[PDB]
């Protein structure tokens, strides 16, 4: 083809956790979203067995890590669901290391 670009996600792929989605929404209709975008290489919606049936967010998984990057400010603050007075948040589930407040003397 042209772009083509049919390949695997990278080694080091980004776990993007997406927050404030109502629990009325399927996996098949996130992807294709995001697909739009990036070339989705897997998709999961955080939904518990037990009590959680569903932590009103999902996991997402973007092939390139740069594309992501797009998606991210593409989205975030972009687009917001039916029903959701606040917009659809981005970002990724890193841990920065941190974990550390209080300053004195000025």
């Known amino acids: 083809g042209s772009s083509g670009s049919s390949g695997m996600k990278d080694h080091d792929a980004i776990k993007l956790?997406?927050?404030?989605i109502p629990r009325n929404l399927d996996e098949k209709d996130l992807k294709p979203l995001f697909e739009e975008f990036?070339?989705?290489?897997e998709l999961t919606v955080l939904k518990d067995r037990f009590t959680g049936m569903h932590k009103g967010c999902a996991f997402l998984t973007y092939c390139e890590r740069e594309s992501a990057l797009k998606a991210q400010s593409a989205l975030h603050e972009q687009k917001?669901?039916?029903g959701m007075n606040r917009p659809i948040q981005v970002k990724p589930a890193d841990s920065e290391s941190r974990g550390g407040s209080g300053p004195s003397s000025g």
């Open 17 to 20: 956790f997406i927050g404030q």
């Open 38 to 41: 990036g070339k989705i290489y």
């Open 80 to 82: 917001t669901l039916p």
